[PDB]
Amino acid sequence: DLSQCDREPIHLLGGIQSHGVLLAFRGPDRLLEVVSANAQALLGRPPETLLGQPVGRVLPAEVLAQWEPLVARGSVRVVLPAGAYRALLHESDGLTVLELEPAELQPGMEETALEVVRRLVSPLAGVKGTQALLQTAADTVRALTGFDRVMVYRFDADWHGEVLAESKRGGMDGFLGMHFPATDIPVQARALYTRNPLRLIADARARPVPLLPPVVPALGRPLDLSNSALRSVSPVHLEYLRNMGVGASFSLSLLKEGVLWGLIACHHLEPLHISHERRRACEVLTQLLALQLSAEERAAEASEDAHRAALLGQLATAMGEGGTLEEVLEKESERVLALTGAAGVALLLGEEPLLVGCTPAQDEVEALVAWLATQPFQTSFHTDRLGTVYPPLAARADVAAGILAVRLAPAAARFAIWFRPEVARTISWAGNPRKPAEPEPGHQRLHPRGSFQAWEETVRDTSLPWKRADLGAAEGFRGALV
Amino acid sequence: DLSQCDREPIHLLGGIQSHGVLLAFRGPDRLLEVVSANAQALLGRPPETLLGQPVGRVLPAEVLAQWEPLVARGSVRVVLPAGAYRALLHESDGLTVLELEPAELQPGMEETALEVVRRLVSPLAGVKGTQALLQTAADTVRALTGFDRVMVYRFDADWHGEVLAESKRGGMDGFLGMHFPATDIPVQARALYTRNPLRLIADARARPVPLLPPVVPALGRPLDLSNSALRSVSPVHLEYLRNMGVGASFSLSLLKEGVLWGLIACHHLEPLHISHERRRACEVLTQLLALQLSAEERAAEASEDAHRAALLGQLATAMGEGGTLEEVLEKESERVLALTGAAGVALLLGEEPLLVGCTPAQDEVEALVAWLATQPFQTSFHTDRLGTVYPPLAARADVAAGILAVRLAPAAARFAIWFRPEVARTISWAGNPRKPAEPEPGHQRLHPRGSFQAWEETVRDTSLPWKRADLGAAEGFRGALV
Ligand SMILES: *CCC1=C(Cc2[nH]c(Cc3[nH]c(CC4=NC(=O)C(C=C)=C4C)c(C)c3CCC(=O)O)c(CCC(=O)O)c2C)NC(=O)[C@H]1C
Ligand SMILES: *CCC1=C(Cc2[nH]c(Cc3[nH]c(CC4=NC(=O)C(C=C)=C4C)c(C)c3CCC(=O)O)c(CCC(=O)O)c2C)NC(=O)[C@H]1C
Numbered sequence A, B: 001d002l003s004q005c006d007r008e009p010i011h012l013l014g015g016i017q018s019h020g021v022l023l024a025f026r027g028p029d030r031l032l033e034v035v036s037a038n039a040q041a042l043l044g045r046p047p048e049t050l051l052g053q054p055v056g057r058v059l060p061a062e063v064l065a066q067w068e069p070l071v072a073r074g075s076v077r078v079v080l081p082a083g084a085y086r087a088l089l090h091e092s093d094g095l096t097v098l099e100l101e102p103a104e105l106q107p108g109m110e111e112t113a114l115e116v117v118r119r120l121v122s123p124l125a126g127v128k129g130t131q132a133l134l135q136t137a138a139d140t141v142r143a144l145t146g147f148d149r150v151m152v153y154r155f156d157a158d159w160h161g162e163v164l165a166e167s168k169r170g171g172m173d174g175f176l177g178m179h180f181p182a183t184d185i186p187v188q189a190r191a192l193y194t195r196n197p198l199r200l201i202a203d204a205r206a207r208p209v210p211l212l213p214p215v216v217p218a219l220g221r222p223l224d225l226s227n228s229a230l231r232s233v234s235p236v237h238l239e240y241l242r243n244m245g246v247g248a249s250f251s252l253s254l255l256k257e258g259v260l261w262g263l264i265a266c267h268h269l270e271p272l273h274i275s276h277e278r279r280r281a282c283e284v285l286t287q288l289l290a291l292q293l294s295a296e297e298r299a300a301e302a303s304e305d306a307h308r309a310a311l312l313g314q315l316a317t318a319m320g321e322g323g324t325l326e327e328v329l330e331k332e333s334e335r336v337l338a339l340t341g342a343a344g345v346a347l348l349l350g351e352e353p354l355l356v357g358c359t360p361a362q363d364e365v366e367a368l369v370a371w372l373a374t375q376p377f378q379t380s381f382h383t384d385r386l387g388t389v390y391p392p393l394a395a396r397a398d399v400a401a402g403i404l405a406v407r408l409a410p411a412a413a414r415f416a417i418w419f420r421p422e423v424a425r426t427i428s429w430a431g432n433p434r435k436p437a438e439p440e441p442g443h444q445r446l447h448p449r450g451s452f453q454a455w456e457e458t459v460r461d462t463s464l465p466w467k468r469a470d471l472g473a474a475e476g477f478r479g480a481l482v
Helices: A061-065 A067-073 A108-119 A131-146 A276-304 A309-319 A325-330 A362-373 A470-481 B061-071 B108-119 B131-145 B276-307 B309-319 B325-336 B362-372 B475-481
Strands: A154-156 A160-162 A346-348 A415-417 B021-024 B097-100 B154-156 B160-162 B428-430 B454-456
Touching: A061 A067, A108 A131, A108 A276, A108 B108, A108 B276, A131 A276, A276 B108, A276 B276, A309 A325, A309 A470, A309 B475, A346 A362, A362 A415, A470 B309, A470 B475, B108 B131, B108 B276, B131 B276, B154 B160, B276 B309, B309 B325, B309 B475
Parallel strands: none
Antiparallel strands: A154 A160, A346 A415, B021 B097, B428 B454
């Protein structure tokens, strides 16, 4: 259900967080289009005052002369009196928006950065697990920027998600694992993330400063301030940081193959600044988890479906050692129950069901196969909510929860299905998971939570997942029987 | 192993490189043991002289401070007068050694080092080949190292291999797709390569130079300068250079998962040098493609094994429809002869076999199992040399070149086998491999082979090797034939 958590158009508000410089260019005489109320404490003149006029009469040697390589390169180094700010510019509406903001100072970066990166890619990164991949990312970002707590909050199925890391200064709180809403990083904000990796809400205690003059003439709405290394970000997300204990919340975003995954998310007690170049090399490490993820949750399969096949290669040479349908589906479906580690399986190869492991009684099954000739799939329907499809076989939530359809033939109920059950689970939310975002009488003006204190919920009457190798252990066993 | 190339004790050989100054202080109260030849140049005295004399009673004030921060840190920033170098050390045989050796002249070395990490990484890399993947990185090695000819090359099957990547400058003789030996980086090299990537012969033409006193007081032979940086080399490797465009080598490990997937040398037309940090930068990137093409085989497998589920599926729902095997197979033949990377096929199910496609004569299909049942296997026998281990069929470079077996019922002579042609496939060999290195009258000191021109090896035999997602389509079939 779309809501104004999603609705509300967070690219175009009134640009930028108060340490910036947007001076923007309709046409070939540059000309100053959308300026910045905060433009008098760099430059020397007020903005209004050169809003109508060229970059001949605006920019100083420093930034101006390297307006050439701006185009050429993407980044340049204006080192004008105030110290050393950045620049960064792309095309907008009819706009060559020069951005521009503070610079890094230390040679650290390469040396710091590197010693850091070779942590997150050693001789063999994954000797004791994937947690140890996840975490180092966390460790290194919090130790590469210089922070307190960070995390690995990944989305799942619902676009829900949970934090899967922690590195800290013994004396904050956290959010260690705890599942907490899908009504946070919503579709308009977290789809602008496939596009615009990195954020910097930082001294997100302070106020947002406007542009000039609100509507960027021609267009109608504000600018398009989405691709801009500065976005002042919404209230709805900042009223909420203020209840959380955040001057700055960084968030370094993620992806492997043209899908999201989760974020990085660095909380800090007071507010901090990270440079174009080094929240760009933040990006180079969040990028570097998304590989070694891809790599060997992939390769895990290969390895881990040899040790599956051997269990097929066993129940195959059974086949080889004397015609014995029933009796050799009996013994080597200890090894079938364990193909997909489960508690049973009933088979309908014509007669009744020689049904073996730890499942329901014939009566129930027979009522199940009929009902299952009613459902629409090419080979194998599976479910992990046995009530949510066929609630006759609810109360069997203790040995049933999912089944593994394989139609052994066309216009027939010839089959085999098995019985995977319910499991504890304490996915723990950051307050009652029902109410995530709660407002005042009318329902147009809504605010944050103000909570996060481990209100538990019990994912229950559920089951496990169905790893690529389950689905695939079946289509090989189709051919076995035929 | 094999011939005066054989034995040579290539590490413990004394003799170092002339821009660095190796020397260790054995003993507890840390006392200068053996000093290195052209040891002064930086050290101000005659080498021999100060052969007793504690840590720093000898080597300056400057380094005496630094003495402390390298015990702890591995690496320090020494700076005497003569531009002045920095030692990276270890503890390579009871004594614990200097490697006092140049520096980074300009803080770009790192600047560059990081951004060429980006070229070889951005998610959307390897999206126009893996020839290109490999190459893309290889292009950003050479970008740093300065060098004038980079390789990146793989050892196939044997411990031979072929230059399968280039990237030279102008008028540079090139091995683009060219090919050469095994007796180059021989047994001795690697065992030494797996533990420390990197080797540098930089004035590869300037002559080594002793280090007093060729054999260690309390041990026997020359040092054992195994792990080091201004070592030298078997007096032969830099020897099979003086008869090439020899600049100075620079080679790396790509130890892929466990084993040595090859390496990547680069030489100039004359002298160069690179630094401790720029070496490590070298190192870091060969870890890279290595990790990269691990993640690519380990992937494109997963693609194949899923790709021929959806084949098999097709197959089994021919298999479970009509009258009998011979009938269903007639068409589905072509579909199974698309599985063992499909070439041809047998099918000895008792009766006179079957030929479904391209095959030889029913006699030769029986005279195979006559041989096969007499010799070993639990199942199956991909030999692509099928005309040598079994030459009754030693002329079938049309119809059969290897085969694929499968025990259909085990302890019983029913198989189901695959014919798989010879394949003409040009090979441009470098000089004559019937000349690894021509020796002198005696056969006891070898100089090398001093020519390397295009050498044709159009082979007729072998057969496009069966892989995992090849071979792998068989375990299932064992199960199918029943
Ligand atoms: C009615 C809409 C609502 C918004 C708007 C909104 N939500 C987000 C996303 C967001 N939420 C969190 C929470 C959080 N605390 C942590 O420690 C971590 C990670 C471990 C998370 C995810 C985060 C971090 C984010 C976005 C990442 C970030 O905040 O840096 C956003 C994104 C902000 C934007 O404008 O881009 C918006 C706009 N918030 C609500 O509660 C509801 C009302
Ligand atoms: C009779 C014994 C022989 C030796 C002894 C020997 N050779 C080497 C070095 C070596 N050869 C190659 C191959 C190679 N890599 C490339 O990129 C190219 C083309 C430009 C070629 C031909 C390599 C890579 C190496 C070592 C890499 C390097 O140069 O650093 C060594 C290694 C000595 C050491 O480990 O320090 C030994 C001991 N070589 C012969 O050909 C025969 C005569």
